[PDB]
Amino acid sequence: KLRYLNILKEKLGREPTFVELQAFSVMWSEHCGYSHTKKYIRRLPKTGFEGNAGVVNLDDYYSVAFKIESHNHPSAIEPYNGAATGVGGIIRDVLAMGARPTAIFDSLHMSRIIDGIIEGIADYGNSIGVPTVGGELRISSLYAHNPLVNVLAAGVVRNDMLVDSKASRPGQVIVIFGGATGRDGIHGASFASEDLTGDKATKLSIQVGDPFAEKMLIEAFLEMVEEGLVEGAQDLGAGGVLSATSELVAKGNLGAIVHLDRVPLREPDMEPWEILISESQERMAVVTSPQKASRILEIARKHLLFGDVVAEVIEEPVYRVMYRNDLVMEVPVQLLANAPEEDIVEYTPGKIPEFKRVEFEEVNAREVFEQYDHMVGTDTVVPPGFGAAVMRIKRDGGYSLVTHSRADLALQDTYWGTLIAVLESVRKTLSVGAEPLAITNCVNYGDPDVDPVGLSAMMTALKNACEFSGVPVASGNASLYNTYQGKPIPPTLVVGMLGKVNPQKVAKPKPSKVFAVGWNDFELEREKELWRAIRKLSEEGAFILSSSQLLTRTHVETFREYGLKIEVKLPEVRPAHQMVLVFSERTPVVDVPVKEIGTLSR
Ligand SMILES: Nc1ncnc2c1ncn2[C@@H]1O[C@H](COP(=O)(O)OP(=O)(O)CP(=O)(O)O)[C@@H](O)[C@H]1O
Ligand SMILES: O=CNCC(=O)N[C@@H]1O[C@H](COP(=O)(O)O)[C@@H](O)[C@H]1O
Ligand SMILES: [Mg+2]
Ligand SMILES: [Mg+2]
């Protein structure tokens, strides 16, 4: 913070004005600036057009846009609105790529079942009409003060309608439609960059949220894209107008002249800076030619949304904020878009540890998911209760989504627990017949300044997991400073995996013999040997289950949907094993251990 203020003073050549301070306090905050993770993320292998979402081609005619963000700090103080809004925001990111939001996936980490979080998410995804196709839930008293709310959203988009995430030429303009701008969330980005005992941990930093407004925003935006009116786009969230406008031009290496007075207000007494950093929801920033602005405004208004032309794209690398004919601020656009970078430390792993038992409560509760009808599997090739969620796109074309993390293992060894989480995410994808395609990930950490190693260990392990597996990183998020009066959460890296699979070849449950296939302990080397065995059996028609517990209550619940009931003598397993359960007619034949342990029937 203060180390940064000096750097700002040196660059500015003098002391910043009130608004200059407010503005950089947002853009250079860890949440928007990424000072501590910038270099690490760069060292990661990438793929797919990365524009605040990350899209991956599936069949050349269609691509899937998937991204994972989080809303941790907000949810610790206002569970209901913090979770909902989290969904609202990640949906705007996927929509901002020209994609049609088709699936939401949740990843909760709490010390008990906080109804608010569950409902906030279910209600919001419900009012906008986008289904929940899955979502891991880990309970541990270690998240008592810092619950982690990570949400993954995937949309489908035509390869020929991909929207850019930046401005591309001087003369373009920037329209901002959606809900009206109020005073909620000001500095909520600076709030998410500190310990929960900060001076900004008040309800003022929390964003509201209106799904009916968003559903409209989804319809309007897609219409704009269908008529080729969108030349570039970015959703609004942290930083509001400031963040969005400056980032669309910094990316293109252009400039902008923002006119705050043209921004639709919901509170007319607001001041220029309040209008600039307000983090109100349901708003989208579209880049286009001056001429198309007319139809875009018409489309949003008839859709019951406000908005007007707010900025002009100029070739000069300056960010000029205007309110009428009175200048508010003015600084080098590339100054804002780039926070000071912090040095990284090199991490070198040790031997895979003898992970001991550290259980995460088995509070399986579908009761709460039914009360708030948080349906998790209405329209998938095969039910999500089993793990991977498979969606169709064509009769014989589809993709899989897997969200996994092993904070339990990582808590003991940041490196190995993380690396293992990424690898296990591959077993699941393979277990359903899908071809690992890319990864979106969310890094959930505490104080980097205090414990720099642990962060380094997460990023190195994630980097090594992609090099060892060949699976690149399409996108991600990084939530740091998840601590309460000192105490930090466990290092929790949540992995979102996307895969390619023919829905006509996805196996379903049927009366059969069950087999424990693999080893009860972990060894990196032979990991690729299990992968090869899953591909073989999966290809033969076998129904495979890849859980860290082998068999869970949900699996059995889901099994009853088929009127099937399993009787198996599960093998004793270590905290990190290399085993999966195979269901087939005959005994599997593979270059890996196989043992008949039970039966599925009726
Ligand atoms: N751990 C990670 N791995 C890979 N990419 C990551 C990453 N963390 C961040 N990114 C990439 O950096 C980009 C920026 O995330 P950032 O949180 O700063 O902005 P944003 O685009 O989400 C808008 P906002 O701040 O308004 O929410 C992401 O869109 C993603 O592609
Ligand atoms: O509406 C936009 N939501 C997008 C967004 O970027 N929101 C911002 O992130 C904070 C949570 O970050 P975390 O604690 O999870 O790291 C939240 O308080 C918002 O200011
Ligand atoms: Mg983010
Ligand atoms: Mg965003």
Side-chain angles (χ1 to χ4, degrees), residues 1-198 200-361 363-602:
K1 174 51 190 54
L2 165 63
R3 182 173 181 274
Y4 294 10
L5 185 57
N6 287 324
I7 293 187
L8 179 54
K9 290 195 296 199
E10 299 188 309
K11 299 287 187 184
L12 282 176
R14 61 105 206 309
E15 286 188 295
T17 68
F18 178 83
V19 190
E20 295 187 302
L21 275 179
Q22 307 311 303
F24 284 75
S25 293
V26 172
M27 299 305 269
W28 283 19
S29 63
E30 193 60 54
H31 178 76
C32 277
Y34 280 63
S35 291
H36 293 72
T37 50
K38 229 156 189 172
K39 305 191 192 312
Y40 292 122
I41 291 168
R42 219 192 304 288
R43 281 184 169 55
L44 302 174
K46 320 292 193 308
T47 41
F49 180 22
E50 46 201 61
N52 78 288
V55 317
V56 176
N57 177 51
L58 272 177
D59 67 324
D60 291 0
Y61 301 81
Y62 286 99
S63 299
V64 172
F66 68 124
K67 159 65 172 309
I68 181 160
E69 280 189 309
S70 64
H71 237 230
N72 300 334
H73 292 81
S75 293
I77 138 179
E78 215 305 64
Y80 187 74
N81 285 308
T85 300
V87 179
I90 190 56
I91 280 292
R92 276 187 297 280
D93 275 313
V94 166
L95 170 72
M97 284 290 83
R100 178 179 82 252
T102 68
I104 300 175
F105 216 108
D106 51 281
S107 187
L108 310 183
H109 305 262
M110 313 163 291
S111 61
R112 74 186 188 70
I113 295 188
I114 312 184
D115 307 69
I117 290 172
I118 306 295
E119 196 191 314
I121 298 178
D123 289 351
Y124 204 116
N126 277 18
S127 303
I128 68 177
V130 181
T132 311
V133 289
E136 71 171 357
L137 173 48
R138 280 61 167 64
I139 298 302
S140 171
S141 49
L142 298 171
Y143 294 106
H145 296 290
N146 298 86
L148 299 187
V149 191
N150 292 180
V151 182
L152 183 157
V156 181
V157 59
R158 283 173 63 177
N159 291 45
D160 46 70
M161 301 197 312
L162 256 180
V163 179
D164 197 303
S165 303
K166 69 179 174 193
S168 277
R169 64 162 219 286
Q172 294 184 299
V173 296
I174 313 180
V175 178
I176 294 188
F177 70 118
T181 300
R183 214 177 317 216
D184 64 290
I186 279 60
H187 283 306
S190 310
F191 155 62
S193 304
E194 305 161 53
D195 180 82
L196 281 182
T197 308
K200 294 186 177 306
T202 73
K203 309 294 181 65
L204 287 181
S205 298
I206 274 61
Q207 292 157 163
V208 189
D210 184 2
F212 298 112
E214 184 139 308
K215 194 204 156 302
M216 292 280 79
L217 180 56
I218 292 175
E219 299 299 311
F221 189 81
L222 294 188
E223 192 168 55
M224 288 168 217
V225 177
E226 278 188 62
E227 304 185 295
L229 311 174
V230 181
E231 310 196 314
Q234 181 161 308
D235 74 291
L236 268 78
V241 182
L242 169 71
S243 170
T245 57
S246 65
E247 295 181 312
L248 282 171
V249 294
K251 294 174 183 173
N253 202 287
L254 298 155
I257 299 174
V258 304
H259 301 285
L260 296 176
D261 51 288
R262 309 274 281 297
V263 168
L265 256 53
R266 187 207 296 161
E267 300 179 51
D269 58 290
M270 279 167 80
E271 305 179 0
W273 73 280
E274 294 180 300
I275 308 183
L276 184 59
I277 70 174
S278 166
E279 296 186 35
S280 298
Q281 311 295 288
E282 341 295 322
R283 302 177 304 167
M284 180 74 83
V286 186
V287 204
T288 305
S289 289
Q291 291 98 172
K292 306 176 191 167
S294 185
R295 241 259 112 176
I296 283 177
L297 299 189
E298 167 189 354
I299 290 166
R301 294 190 277 93
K302 82 183 185 71
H303 270 277
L304 283 36
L305 302 174
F306 315 84
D308 182 38
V309 182
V310 186
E312 305 169 61
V313 176
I314 72 170
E315 199 167 59
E316 240 257 294
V318 305
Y319 190 61
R320 190 181 308 161
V321 182
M322 222 67 209
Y323 188 93
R324 295 266 181 56
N325 311 311
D326 297 35
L327 178 72
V328 167
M329 183 176 80
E330 166 151 287
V331 287
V333 70
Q334 291 304 309
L335 179 66
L336 286 167
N338 286 285
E341 282 175 60
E342 302 288 42
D343 279 352
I344 64 178
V345 313
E346 299 293 300
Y347 183 73
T348 300
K351 317 302 177 184
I352 301 176
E354 292 276 298
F355 291 109
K356 65 180 184 300
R357 96 291 194 296
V358 181
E359 184 69 0
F360 270 25
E361 289 72 298
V363 194
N364 189 303
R366 198 66 184 182
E367 44 197 58
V368 192
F369 290 45
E370 289 193 62
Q371 171 182 166
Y372 307 120
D373 67 14
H374 175 285
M375 310 135 294
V376 184
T378 64
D379 186 40
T380 55
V381 175
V382 64
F386 289 137
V390 188
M391 274 58 73
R392 297 193 176 77
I393 287 188
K394 293 300 185 305
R395 168 184 297 164
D396 56 358
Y399 59 100
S400 63
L401 296 178
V402 172
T403 278
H404 185 62
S405 66
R406 300 301 304 281
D408 66 305
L409 298 177
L411 188 60
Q412 307 169 57
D413 186 311
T414 305
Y415 184 82
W416 290 104
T418 305
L419 181 68
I420 285 167
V422 185
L423 294 194
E424 288 199 311
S425 296
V426 183
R427 296 174 189 173
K428 297 180 187 298
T429 302
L430 294 186
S431 300
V432 73
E435 195 72 68
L437 240 41
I439 294 175
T440 177
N441 62 80
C442 187
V443 181
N444 296 284
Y445 199 72
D447 211 316
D449 313 36
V450 169
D451 184 2
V453 189
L455 206 206
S456 187
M458 277 183 87
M459 315 314 298
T460 300
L462 167 60
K463 176 166 164 292
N464 302 330
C466 294
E467 310 189 314
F468 168 92
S469 72
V471 183
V473 177
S475 70
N477 178 247
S479 177
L480 302 195
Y481 293 113
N482 288 289
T483 58
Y484 183 58
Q485 56 177 45
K487 319 156 186 174
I489 59 165
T492 320
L493 173 68
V494 182
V495 181
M497 193 156 289
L498 194 260
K500 192 175 182 181
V501 61
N502 187 310
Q504 304 180 304
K505 315 178 198 297
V506 181
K508 303 267 288 189
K510 65 168 57 189
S512 61
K513 292 190 170 188
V514 183
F515 301 78
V517 181
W519 300 272
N520 53 59
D521 60 320
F522 181 91
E523 280 183 49
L524 178 54
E525 319 84 58
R526 65 198 189 176
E527 182 66 34
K528 293 195 185 182
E529 276 298 280
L530 183 73
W531 292 6
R532 200 156 62 60
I534 296 163
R535 296 184 168 295
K536 182 185 193 305
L537 295 180
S538 181
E539 180 59 57
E540 292 176 353
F543 180 67
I544 311 170
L545 255 181
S546 175
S547 175
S548 62
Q549 289 187 176
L550 296 183
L551 179 63
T552 65
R553 277 194 33 54
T554 310
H555 292 155
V556 187
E557 297 187 306
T558 300
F559 269 130
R560 269 203 286 294
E561 271 171 44
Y562 292 73
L564 300 175
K565 308 184 178 184
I566 18 66
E567 183 196 60
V568 294
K569 178 190 64 181
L570 285 185
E572 199 157 65
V573 132
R574 293 190 69 283
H577 60 83
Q578 251 159 165
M579 192 168 282
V580 301
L581 295 174
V582 177
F583 312 76
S584 50
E585 337 301 76
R586 19 123 287 175
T587 306
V589 208
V590 285
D591 302 340
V592 160
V594 163
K595 172 185 172 55
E596 201 174 310
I597 69 160
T599 174
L600 177 72
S601 62
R602 287 42 295 177

mmCIF file of all heavy atoms in Angstrom, residues 31-32 34 41 44 52 67 69 238 441 443 473 475-478, ligand 1:
data_model
loop_
_atom_site.group_PDB
_atom_site.id
_atom_site.type_symbol
_atom_site.label_atom_id
_atom_site.label_comp_id
_atom_site.label_asym_id
_atom_site.label_seq_id
_atom_site.Cartn_x
_atom_site.Cartn_y
_atom_site.Cartn_z
ATOM 1 N N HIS A 31 -6.901 -6.901 -5.520
ATOM 2 C CA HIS A 31 -8.012 -7.452 -6.278
ATOM 3 C C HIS A 31 -7.998 -7.067 -7.755
ATOM 4 O O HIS A 31 -8.300 -7.892 -8.618
ATOM 5 C CB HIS A 31 -9.360 -7.037 -5.676
ATOM 6 C CG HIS A 31 -10.533 -7.545 -6.457
ATOM 7 N ND1 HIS A 31 -10.951 -8.857 -6.400
ATOM 8 C CD2 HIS A 31 -11.313 -6.942 -7.386
ATOM 9 C CE1 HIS A 31 -11.935 -9.042 -7.263
ATOM 10 N NE2 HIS A 31 -12.173 -7.896 -7.874
ATOM 11 N N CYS A 32 -7.667 -5.813 -8.047
ATOM 12 C CA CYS A 32 -7.639 -5.347 -9.431
ATOM 13 C C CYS A 32 -6.240 -5.344 -10.060
ATOM 14 O O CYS A 32 -6.095 -5.556 -11.263
ATOM 15 C CB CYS A 32 -8.264 -3.947 -9.521
ATOM 16 S SG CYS A 32 -10.087 -3.921 -9.632
ATOM 17 N N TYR A 34 -3.339 -7.326 -8.884
ATOM 18 C CA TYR A 34 -2.650 -8.624 -8.896
ATOM 19 C C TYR A 34 -1.127 -8.504 -8.755
ATOM 20 O O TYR A 34 -0.387 -9.244 -9.401
ATOM 21 C CB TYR A 34 -2.955 -9.380 -10.194
ATOM 22 C CG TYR A 34 -4.289 -10.103 -10.240
ATOM 23 C CD1 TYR A 34 -5.494 -9.406 -10.169
ATOM 24 C CD2 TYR A 34 -4.342 -11.492 -10.387
ATOM 25 C CE1 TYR A 34 -6.713 -10.077 -10.247
ATOM 26 C CE2 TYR A 34 -5.552 -12.166 -10.464
ATOM 27 C CZ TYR A 34 -6.730 -11.455 -10.394
ATOM 28 O OH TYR A 34 -7.927 -12.121 -10.474
ATOM 29 N N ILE A 41 1.392 -16.178 -12.668
ATOM 30 C CA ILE A 41 0.389 -16.440 -13.693
ATOM 31 C C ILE A 41 1.007 -16.443 -15.083
ATOM 32 O O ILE A 41 0.586 -17.202 -15.957
ATOM 33 C CB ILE A 41 -0.739 -15.371 -13.641
ATOM 34 C CG1 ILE A 41 -1.561 -15.552 -12.358
ATOM 35 C CG2 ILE A 41 -1.615 -15.458 -14.895
ATOM 36 C CD1 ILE A 41 -2.493 -14.402 -12.046
ATOM 37 N N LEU A 44 2.556 -19.643 -16.203
ATOM 38 C CA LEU A 44 1.610 -20.727 -16.463
ATOM 39 C C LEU A 44 1.333 -20.896 -17.965
ATOM 40 O O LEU A 44 1.316 -19.917 -18.722
ATOM 41 C CB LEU A 44 0.277 -20.458 -15.741
ATOM 42 C CG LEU A 44 0.176 -20.251 -14.217
ATOM 43 C CD1 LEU A 44 -1.264 -19.870 -13.842
ATOM 44 C CD2 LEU A 44 0.615 -21.513 -13.475
ATOM 45 N N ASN A 52 -11.199 -11.971 -20.329
ATOM 46 C CA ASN A 52 -12.007 -11.983 -19.104
ATOM 47 C C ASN A 52 -12.994 -13.154 -19.037
ATOM 48 O O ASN A 52 -14.070 -13.044 -18.444
ATOM 49 C CB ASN A 52 -12.749 -10.646 -18.911
ATOM 50 C CG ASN A 52 -13.977 -10.507 -19.796
ATOM 51 O OD1 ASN A 52 -13.874 -10.330 -21.011
ATOM 52 N ND2 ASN A 52 -15.153 -10.579 -19.183
ATOM 53 N N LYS A 67 -15.108 -19.676 -16.985
ATOM 54 C CA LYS A 67 -14.247 -18.917 -16.084
ATOM 55 C C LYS A 67 -14.715 -19.069 -14.637
ATOM 56 O O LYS A 67 -15.896 -19.244 -14.374
ATOM 57 C CB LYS A 67 -14.276 -17.436 -16.507
ATOM 58 C CG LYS A 67 -13.870 -16.415 -15.454
ATOM 59 C CD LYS A 67 -12.421 -16.524 -15.017
ATOM 60 C CE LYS A 67 -12.087 -15.346 -14.114
ATOM 61 N NZ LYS A 67 -12.482 -14.041 -14.750
ATOM 62 N N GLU A 69 -14.557 -17.301 -10.762
ATOM 63 C CA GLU A 69 -14.231 -16.144 -9.948
ATOM 64 C C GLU A 69 -14.692 -16.497 -8.548
ATOM 65 O O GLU A 69 -15.172 -17.613 -8.306
ATOM 66 C CB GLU A 69 -14.948 -14.879 -10.441
ATOM 67 C CG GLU A 69 -14.291 -14.205 -11.651
ATOM 68 C CD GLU A 69 -14.900 -12.843 -11.986
ATOM 69 O OE1 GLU A 69 -16.140 -12.749 -12.112
ATOM 70 O OE2 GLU A 69 -14.138 -11.863 -12.132
ATOM 71 N N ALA A 238 -15.877 -4.811 -10.043
ATOM 72 C CA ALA A 238 -14.990 -4.078 -9.161
ATOM 73 C C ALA A 238 -14.382 -2.899 -9.926
ATOM 74 O O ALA A 238 -13.765 -3.081 -10.978
ATOM 75 C CB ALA A 238 -13.909 -4.997 -8.658
ATOM 76 N N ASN A 441 -8.871 -21.774 -13.077
ATOM 77 C CA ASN A 441 -8.607 -22.062 -11.682
ATOM 78 C C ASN A 441 -8.769 -20.833 -10.820
ATOM 79 O O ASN A 441 -8.698 -19.709 -11.316
ATOM 80 C CB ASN A 441 -7.189 -22.621 -11.541
ATOM 81 C CG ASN A 441 -6.126 -21.628 -11.980
ATOM 82 O OD1 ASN A 441 -5.756 -20.720 -11.231
ATOM 83 N ND2 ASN A 441 -5.640 -21.789 -13.207
ATOM 84 N N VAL A 443 -7.284 -19.301 -7.210
ATOM 85 C CA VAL A 443 -6.336 -19.405 -6.116
ATOM 86 C C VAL A 443 -6.893 -18.685 -4.897
ATOM 87 O O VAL A 443 -7.128 -17.479 -4.936
ATOM 88 C CB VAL A 443 -4.991 -18.778 -6.494
ATOM 89 C CG1 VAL A 443 -4.003 -18.916 -5.336
ATOM 90 C CG2 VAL A 443 -4.450 -19.449 -7.751
ATOM 91 N N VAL A 473 -3.814 -23.794 -19.127
ATOM 92 C CA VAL A 473 -4.715 -22.937 -18.361
ATOM 93 C C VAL A 473 -5.365 -21.894 -19.256
ATOM 94 O O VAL A 473 -4.676 -21.044 -19.812
ATOM 95 C CB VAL A 473 -3.956 -22.182 -17.250
ATOM 96 C CG1 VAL A 473 -4.900 -21.250 -16.517
ATOM 97 C CG2 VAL A 473 -3.320 -23.170 -16.289
ATOM 98 N N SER A 475 -7.944 -19.738 -18.178
ATOM 99 C CA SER A 475 -8.272 -18.540 -17.409
ATOM 100 C C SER A 475 -8.195 -18.807 -15.912
ATOM 101 O O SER A 475 -7.811 -19.895 -15.484
ATOM 102 C CB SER A 475 -9.685 -18.066 -17.750
ATOM 103 O OG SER A 475 -10.648 -18.972 -17.234
ATOM 104 N N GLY A 476 -8.572 -17.812 -15.119
ATOM 105 C CA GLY A 476 -8.539 -17.994 -13.687
ATOM 106 C C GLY A 476 -8.874 -16.770 -12.868
ATOM 107 O O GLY A 476 -9.369 -15.760 -13.380
ATOM 108 N N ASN A 477 -8.590 -16.867 -11.575
ATOM 109 C CA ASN A 477 -8.856 -15.795 -10.630
ATOM 110 C C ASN A 477 -7.905 -15.992 -9.462
ATOM 111 O O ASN A 477 -7.375 -17.085 -9.278
ATOM 112 C CB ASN A 477 -10.307 -15.888 -10.143
ATOM 113 C CG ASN A 477 -10.659 -14.824 -9.115
ATOM 114 O OD1 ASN A 477 -10.906 -15.126 -7.944
ATOM 115 N ND2 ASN A 477 -10.680 -13.569 -9.549
ATOM 116 N N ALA A 478 -7.673 -14.938 -8.688
ATOM 117 C CA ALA A 478 -6.802 -15.050 -7.529
ATOM 118 C C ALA A 478 -7.297 -14.173 -6.395
ATOM 119 O O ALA A 478 -7.208 -12.945 -6.458
ATOM 120 C CB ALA A 478 -5.384 -14.680 -7.886
HETATM 121 N N1 LIG B 1 -4.794 -17.859 -11.440
HETATM 122 C C1 LIG B 1 -5.014 -17.421 -12.713
HETATM 123 N N2 LIG B 1 -4.716 -18.303 -13.761
HETATM 124 C C2 LIG B 1 -4.922 -17.914 -15.067
HETATM 125 N N3 LIG B 1 -5.419 -16.680 -15.416
HETATM 126 C C3 LIG B 1 -5.709 -15.817 -14.366
HETATM 127 C C4 LIG B 1 -5.544 -16.079 -12.982
HETATM 128 N N4 LIG B 1 -5.917 -15.039 -12.228
HETATM 129 C C5 LIG B 1 -6.307 -14.156 -13.149
HETATM 130 N N5 LIG B 1 -6.213 -14.553 -14.436
HETATM 131 C C6 LIG B 1 -6.561 -13.860 -15.745
HETATM 132 O O1 LIG B 1 -6.407 -12.447 -15.561
HETATM 133 C C7 LIG B 1 -7.598 -11.831 -15.964
HETATM 134 C C8 LIG B 1 -8.094 -10.792 -14.899
HETATM 135 O O2 LIG B 1 -8.767 -11.021 -13.641
HETATM 136 P P1 LIG B 1 -9.102 -9.671 -12.822
HETATM 137 O O3 LIG B 1 -9.758 -10.229 -11.574
HETATM 138 O O4 LIG B 1 -8.018 -8.675 -12.551
HETATM 139 O O5 LIG B 1 -10.224 -8.988 -13.750
HETATM 140 P P2 LIG B 1 -11.783 -9.148 -14.287
HETATM 141 O O6 LIG B 1 -11.610 -9.313 -15.762
HETATM 142 O O7 LIG B 1 -12.231 -10.395 -13.663
HETATM 143 C C9 LIG B 1 -12.766 -7.853 -14.149
HETATM 144 P P3 LIG B 1 -13.158 -7.416 -12.515
HETATM 145 O O8 LIG B 1 -11.934 -7.047 -11.698
HETATM 146 O O9 LIG B 1 -14.004 -6.196 -12.874
HETATM 147 O O10 LIG B 1 -13.924 -8.489 -11.825
HETATM 148 C C10 LIG B 1 -8.667 -12.861 -15.936
HETATM 149 O O11 LIG B 1 -9.716 -12.496 -16.794
HETATM 150 C C11 LIG B 1 -7.915 -14.168 -16.262
HETATM 151 O O12 LIG B 1 -8.003 -14.469 -17.640
#
